[PDB]
From Swiss-Prot:
Entry's localization field: Cell outer membrane
Protein name: Outer membrane usher protein PapC
Main location: membrane
Top-level taxonomy: Bacteria, Pseudomonadati, Pseudomonadota, Gammaproteobacteria, Enterobacterales
Organism: Escherichia coli
Protein purpose: Involved in the export and assembly of pili subunits across the outer membrane. Forms a hexameric ring-shaped pore in the outer bacterial membrane. The 2 nanometer-diameter pore allows the passage of the thin tip fibrillum. As for the rod, it probably unwinds into linear fibers which would therefore be narrow enough to pass through the pore.
Bilayer topology annotation: Multi-pass membrane protein
């Protein structure tokens, strides 16, 4: 038995006389039964205000085994999970899946030492402190396909919020071989039975081609595409896919999609038809009576480009049939003569511009739009690091001190924050540990 714990807590007070305590936490509690790999996800967060309210929940988000099959070349994972697929959009479920054997970045800015949470469906994928300023987040693993729910939760009260869409890399294969998943169970937490599956043949000198299909009683979907490795100029794929959903009306429509991988630079385009429905969408319809957020024209790029500068750009637009256009765009330009970073982003619609600058010895000044904000400060570093800052928010002075420790199996951080005329204290812990 081990455990991969993540723990945040925070405490805010307020001139006008208010209190807030926060405390979240998630993780995995594992054990290894012989050849079997046994894993149980748990999450949940609880908070209290004072003017007097309190939110509070808890769960075991997933609970599933998985076993590597040496000699057959695929892993069996059986129990509660959420389907990842190289063609289809995800959804929750309890089933068994058999699949072949074989990493998204999340950017933005932070008014303050907010705490950042990343997820999809309701599943928490990252949830901890980040030092006010521009940010980037890699503690997400490899398996994450599709789009992500993001929320910045500022020490001051403004929660900000946005949406990211990972780079779905082309479904290609090496000439000789072939890749595939075969999943089948009953959709989890609302179920009805179903069985899905997708493969991809190396017909690849540089061209492979792939297809698959969803099968779920009333609902069935079908898709098929090819993909072409160009070598150095990048990668490219495209596929069509069709919905069919009867609810004892039956909705119909199809979607196309472009993939521009390169290994980085990815770009993607999806277009879906009026009544086209990704199995997730048809569940949120057929069981929650939600036919909203009709997906129409999506467009995403991811770009990190290094020459004596750094050029990370992450754009994503989703135009809807029924709801108004969605715009999220966040760019960061970093020059490394000393080092300078200028940064944009747009989380009702929001806009942050942030310019930071920094001198070794490390010390630094900054600037931040929102409510404009100017600060300077110093940061030591030692193994672990710890930085201090003074400045002015608008009139009200601002003070902020941040500590981080980055051991290999036990991280931890701590921030103290105070504006004149709120003040918060913060702590994030994470790492491995044994119970037995």
């Amino acid at each position: 038995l081990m455990l991969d714990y993540n723990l945040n807590g925070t405490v805010s007070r307020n001139y006008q006389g208010g209190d807030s305590h926060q405390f979240s936490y998630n993780g995995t509690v594992g054990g290894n039964l012989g050849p079997w790999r046994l894993r149980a996800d748990y999450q949940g967060s609880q908070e209290q205000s004072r003017y007097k309210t309190t939110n509070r929940n808890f769960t075991w988000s997933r609970f599933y085994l998985f076993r590597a099959i040496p000699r057959w070349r695929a892993n069996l994972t059986l129990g509660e999970n959420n389907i990842n697929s190289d063609i289809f959009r995800s959804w929750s479920y309890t089933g068994a899946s058999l699949e072949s054997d074989d990493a998204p970045q999340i950017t933005g800015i932070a008014e303050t030492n907010a705490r950042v949470v990343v997820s999809q469906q309701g599943r928490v994928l990252y949830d901890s402190m980040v030092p006010a300023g521009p940010f980037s987040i890699q503690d997400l693993d490899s398996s994450v396909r599709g789009r992500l729910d993001v929320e910045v939760i500022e020490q001051n009260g403004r929660k900000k919020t946005f949406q990211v869409d990972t780079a779905s890399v082309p479904y290609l294969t090496r000439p000789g071989q072939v890749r595939y998943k075969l999943v089948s169970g009953r959709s989890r937490g609302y179920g009805p039975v179903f069985a899905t599956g997708e493969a991809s043949w190396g017909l690849s000198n540089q061209w492979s081609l792939y297809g698959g299909a969803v099968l779920a009683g009333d609902y069935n979907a079908l898709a098929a595409g090819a993909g072409w490795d160009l070598g150095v100029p990048g990668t490219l794929s495209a596929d069509i896919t069709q919905s069919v959903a009867r609810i004892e009306r039956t909705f119909q429509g199809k979607s196309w999609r472009l993939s521009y991988s390169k290994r980085i630079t990815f770009a993607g385009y999806r277009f879906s038809e009026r009544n086209y429905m990704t199995m997730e969408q048809y569940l949120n319809a057929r069981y929650r009576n939600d036919y909203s957020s009709r997906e129409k024209e999506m467009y995403t790029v991811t770009l990190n480009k290094n020459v004596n500068t750094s050029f990370n750009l992450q754009y994503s637009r989703q135009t809807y049939w029924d709801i108004r256009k969605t715009d999220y765009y966040t760019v960061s330009v970093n020059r490394y003569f000393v080092a300078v970073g200028l940064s944009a982003s747009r989380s009702r619609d929001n806009d942050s511009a942030y310019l930071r600058i920094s001198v070794p010895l490390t010390a630094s000044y900054s600037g931040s739009m929102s409510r404009y904000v100017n600060m300077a400060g110093y940061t030591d570093t030692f193994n672990d690091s710890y930085s201090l800052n003074a400045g002015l928010n608008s009139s009200q002075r601002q003070i902020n001190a941040y500590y981080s420790h980055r051991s290999p199996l036990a991280n931890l951080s701590a921030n103290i924050a105070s504006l004149q005329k709120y003040t918060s204290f913060g702590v994030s812990a994470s790492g491995g540990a044994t119970i037995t």
